[PDB]
Amino acid sequence: ATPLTSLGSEQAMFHGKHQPGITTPMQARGHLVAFDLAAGAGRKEAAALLRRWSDTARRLMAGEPAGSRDTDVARDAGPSSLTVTFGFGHSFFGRTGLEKQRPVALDPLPDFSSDHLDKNRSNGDLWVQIGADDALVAFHALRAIQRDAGAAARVRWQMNGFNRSPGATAHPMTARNLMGQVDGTRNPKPGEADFDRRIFVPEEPAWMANGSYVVVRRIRMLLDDWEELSLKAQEDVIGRRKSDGAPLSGGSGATESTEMDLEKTDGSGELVVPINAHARITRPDQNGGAAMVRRPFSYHDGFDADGVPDAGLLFVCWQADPLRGFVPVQRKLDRGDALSQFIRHEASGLFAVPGGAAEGEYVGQRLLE
Amino acid sequence: TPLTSLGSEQAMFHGKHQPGITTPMQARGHLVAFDLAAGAGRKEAAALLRRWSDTARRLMAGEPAGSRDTDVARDAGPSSLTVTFGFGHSFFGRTGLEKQRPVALDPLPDFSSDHLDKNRSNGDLWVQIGADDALVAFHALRAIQRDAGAAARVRWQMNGFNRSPGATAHPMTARNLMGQVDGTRNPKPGEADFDRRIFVPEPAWMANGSYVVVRRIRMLLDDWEELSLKAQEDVIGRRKSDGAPLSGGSGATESTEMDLEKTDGSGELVVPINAHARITRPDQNGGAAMVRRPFSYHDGFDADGVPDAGLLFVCWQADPLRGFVPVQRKLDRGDALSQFIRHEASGLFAVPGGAAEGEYVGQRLLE
Ligand code: HEM
Ligand code: HEM
């Protein structure tokens, strides 16, 4: 029996080889935030900020207050699987005299023909991902991180998301998105032999050892168009069934885990999994081994005047090198994916997320020290 | 209590009262107002409430929509979903139903501290959706909104959240984003004068209904969070740690009765004369009373770093003139809290009784 109290009592490690929020289980609530350094904040002020943030992270992730004038918003809750994760944008390095430690991996993402990016709501010197299974726990953490920045950095952009709660389903299972698709079946997983090679910078620039690169994309779903489609049309866009996430190449006996048959054909000769289906064309074996861990939140921020919902996927993917991950896959998807017609990339960020802090350290200490 | 309870718990659609009034607080909420379109009158409104009621019914039972289901809620339990419908003052002019417009829908006062967005206030129709799962909740919002079709547009829509089930070691009263214990003195079904306070007794189309007042109240968290603990506790008159009255001792808890006469060693009132939890009490307002059942909100930051965060205050009464209205008249300038909040949207809606088996909500008004 998993008790209901597990939701609050579950606690994620702050200290580790890798920062939390990469391999950590899906969380019900997320807040993504980007900060820009203030005028006259340099390396010294940035190192002080990351220390403040790390100390706050450590405390919050253990269910402990953020000091004397902790707001009490999270009081009485357990840690609720809170994680906080920190990253650095391309622009950070020229603000802090660290241009020589700027990884080539932060070179700007391509200008994809399908981009509709609000550049104000994109990019940033610093990125923080907050997730938890309790909304007060999560808001408390966002507010504490944001208040820790004080005058040394300002909020550039901030987005809210959500996922399925623990216990919503009779047994734990892969999540859904606002298209109604099963979302997360084929991620690389820890324990696979190539998982670290795919996802993390190895231990032997040196400050990124055991770090990863995240790509964030605010992707609006065109639900008004999507929801006029037949099931057959929606399933053809993905290549997997809405009911259980099994490949279209599968039988009634097929389930989520049954391997895709990418050569299966109709009586009529036509491929059962379409040639431009999203879950065909995104696979590492269709992309020279290009791979990523996808760990998103869904979003809904309202309706415009014509009733169009501002709803979609806060796409967050993780990779050792964007050029072997996000970038070549997106390059194919831009025009080549059946899904493109139904989505709109409306904001983006690429951040270097270092390894976990050890005892007595702050996140990014190797970089700033 | 197993973790699957989150999903498996089911609120009832059919009943004397609509769900979402006395129902326990939910982790996720969506509030939406609609305006009728040109060419939607009473017959179009009745069809709309029939559609909506059927969707509410299915969805509250954990079933897919009747048709064109999106699969977004598939695999999930009912997750305590509730759907609640009301009618605004303007509705009755739109549908030739002015003779059935309740007195109780007459416009709220223009409070001196109002800073109301007229475009995100009021509305012909209001729907309140809440659940403990966010995909269950979004799926319901989207289904209700798609039922509107040609009959009605979305006028405004706000998202809200609360504590999750299981977040605490055992069930406790809610907190808000000011970090206060919030809901201690909310009246409950078995308390003495509850029905008279909250429900129209069995125009007649409102029988067993209730009037809801919605206020989008921003919390001026930048100013609030620079106050000392002592100053914050003086604003409310209860402690943040445990929600006890300031008049309570070391052993006092949230439920301990407040002592409104108690003074300190220097003859000053221990619960301040303008504390919020003093001045809002029924016994300070001629018996005025309400059920409060809010959601917190956070919609991001403005350009200058100020959070668009606060309380989606939702309160329930048999008559606003014996609930929200006289209390808010008192609070407007008198309340220590008012300095750290701003009211930025408002709605007042008539929420009829719940649907019987094989009925739609609002049927006795719209037929
Ligand atoms: C809102 C936008 C998107 C939606 C709705 C969507 C939906 C899905 C779905 C339903 C699956 C199949 C189940 C699974 O394995 O998770 C999937 C797989 C995948 N998607 Fe997406 N996706 C979106 C955007 C992206 C983008 C922008 C990328 C990368 C540039 C991407 C990369 C992948 C990858 C790599 C897989 C796994 C392929 C495999 O190995 O089977 N997706 N996506
Ligand atoms: C952001 C706005 C507000 C906040 C933060 C707030 C907070 C609180 C808190 C902490 C309590 C004490 C605990 C409890 O009994 O629930 C309380 C009680 C109460 N508040 Fe509010 N409140 C707000 C707005 C309002 C408004 C607008 C009204 C009505 C006009 C209202 C009416 C009440 C009532 C009737 C009580 C219970 C009094 C009693 O009988 O003990 N509040 N509020």
Residue numbers in the entry:
A (entry chain B): 69 to 272, 280 to 444
B (entry chain A): 70 to 271, 280 to 444
According to the publication:
Furthermore, in situ X-ray-driven generation of haem intermediates in crystals of the dye-decolourizing-type peroxidase A (DtpA) from Streptomyces lividans is described. We describe the use of online UV–visible spectroscopy to monitor the X-ray-generated formation of an oxyferrous complex of the dye-decolorizing-type peroxidase A (DtpA) from Streptomyces lividans, allowing its structural characterization. High-resolution crystal structures determined using synchrotron radiation are central to our understanding of haem-protein function. The correct assignment of crystal structures to the correct protein redox and ligand states is essential to avoid the misinterpretation of structural data. This is a particular concern for haem proteins, which can occupy a wide range of redox states and are exquisitely sensitive to becoming reduced by solvated electrons generated from interactions of X-rays with water molecules in the crystal.
A further high-resolution crystal structure was determined using a second dose of 0.99 MGy (an accumulated dose of 1.98 MGy) to a resolution of 1.49 Å. One O atom is ligated to the haem Fe at adistances of 2.3 and 2.1 Å in monomers A and B, respectively, as well as making a polar interaction with the distal pocket residue Arg369. Therefore, we conclude from the structure and the spectroscopic data that the haem is in a six-coordinate ferrous state with an O atom bound (oxy­ferrous). Examination of the electron-density maps and structures for the two successive DtpA structures (with accumulated doses of 0.99 and 1.98 MGy, respectively) revealed no substantial differences in coordinates or B factors and no appreciable signs of specific radiation damage beyond the haem pocket. For the present crystal the 0.99 MGy initial structure has two molecules in the crystallo­graphic asymmetric unit, denoted here as A and B, and has been determined to 1.45 Å resolution. See Table 2 for crystallographic data-collection statistics and refinement details and Table 3 for geometrical values for the haem site of the oxyferrous DtpA structure. The structures allowed the assignment of 100 K spectra to either a diatomic (oxygen) or monatomic (compound III) state, while the spectra allowed X-ray and ligand-soaking effects to be precisely monitored.
